[PDB]
Amino acid sequence: GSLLDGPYQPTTFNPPTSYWILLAPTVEGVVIQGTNNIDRWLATILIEPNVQTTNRIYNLFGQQVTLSVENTSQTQWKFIDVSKTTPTGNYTQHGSLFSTPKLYAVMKFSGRIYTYNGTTPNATTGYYSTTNYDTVNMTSFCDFYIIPRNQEEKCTEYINHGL
Ligand X SMILES: CO[C@]1(C(=O)O)C[C@H](O)[C@@H](NC(C)=O)[C@H]([C@H](O)[C@H](O)CO)O1
**Would you say 96 and 78 are in contact if contact means Cβ atoms under 8 Å apart?**
yes
Nearest residue to 77 (alpha-carbon basis) of 49, 108, 105: 49
Q: Which of residues 30-89 bind ligand X (CB under 6 A)?
A: 53, 68-70, 83
From ligand X, Na ion, none, interface partner of 53 (C-beta below 5 to 8 A by class): ligand X
DSSP 5: E
Output 24 or 82, the one with its CB closest to ligand X. Answer: 82
Work out how close the CB of 145 gets to ligand X at its nearest, in angstroms, rounded to a whole number. 22
> For residues 37 and 14, what is the distance between their CA atoms, to the nearest angstrom?
13
Q: Does 99 bind Na ion (CB under 5 A)?
A: no
**Would you say 103 and 23 are in contact if contact means Cβ atoms under 8 Å apart?**
yes
Output 8 or 127, the one with its CB closest to ligand X. Answer: 127
Q: Does 128 bind ligand X (CB under 6 A)?
A: yes
- Could you count the other beta carbons within 10 Å of the beta carbon of residue 49? 14
For ligand X, the binding residues (CB under 6 A) are 53, 68-70, 83, 92-95, 117, 126-129
For Na ion, the binding residues (CB under 5 A) are 81, 95, 97, 115, 117
